[PDB]
Amino acid sequence: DPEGSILAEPEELNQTEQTTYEVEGIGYDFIPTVLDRTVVDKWFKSNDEEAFTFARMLIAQEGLLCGGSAGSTVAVAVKAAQELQEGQRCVVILPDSVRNYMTKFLSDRWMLQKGFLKEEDLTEKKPWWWHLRVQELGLS
Amino acid sequence: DPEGSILAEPEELNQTEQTTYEVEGIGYDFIPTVLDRTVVDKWFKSNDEEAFTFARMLIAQEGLLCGGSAGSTVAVAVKAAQELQEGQRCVVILPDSVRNYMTKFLSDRWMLQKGFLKEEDLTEKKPWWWHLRVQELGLS
Secondary structure, three states, rough: OOOOOOOOOOOOHHOOOOOOOOOOOOOOOOOOOHHHHHHHHOOOEHHHHHHHHHHHHHHHOOOOOOOOHHHEEEEHHHHHHOOOOOOOOOOOOOOOEEEHHHOOOOOHHHHHHHOOOOHHHHHHHHOOOHOOHHHHHHOO | EEEOOOOOEEEEEEEHOOOOOOOOOOOOOOOOOOHHHHHOOOOOOOOOOHHHHHHHHHHHHHHHEEEHHHHHHHHHHHHHHHHHOOOOOOOOOOOOHHHHHOOOOHHHHHHHHOOOOEEEEEEEOOHOOOOHOOOOOOOO
């Protein structure tokens, strides 16, 4: 359940100042009738930053063209499955595709504007010549 | 005695193929009537390249504004004087000043033009930034 929603229980997890989040399709300000919270063993809260980071990581490392909700699910799973051991199995549901987010997190400009990416993080992975200026080239 | 000239004795010293040299004021293709070679203990041959190098060294290090002929004398002095020990004294005659050679060896272009200097040899003493290009500067 993303931060800013009230679905997650116990209620102590929902104590946050903001109720606006960029992730789409999950989280609500009310408990839907169809939702049976009694069968959910445990709940985890997630934030937009980790969701989009994990979605990008999924796209780049596994080839799964998924959206933000999938990123949130995988981010929660990497924490929850720590209690598991070898020979056990985990399953995560990836709801939607990246077609609905082409100009959203899939775009670096949007993430930088929203603050989910930092110049330090973006440039740390870049090669040595990334910061050299154009004038250093041989050009005429 | 400069190379090409025949003032030096024994005659075996004067066995060289070129009869012309850049240095001025010393050396002739004949023995002057006033020259009494008998009072000279030893003779040395000299060339332009070493003479001008010492002349520049004299100016750059000893502060002596003397011509190439003075450089020739010192160029041989460092070789002949090696037989002397501490407490002994050596005297070198410096004929004339640098005034008569401004466009000559005093000019780096003239030395490079005559081949007495090499680009790699000359530039090896220059700072590390010597071979960088203008485009690398910050300019607007």
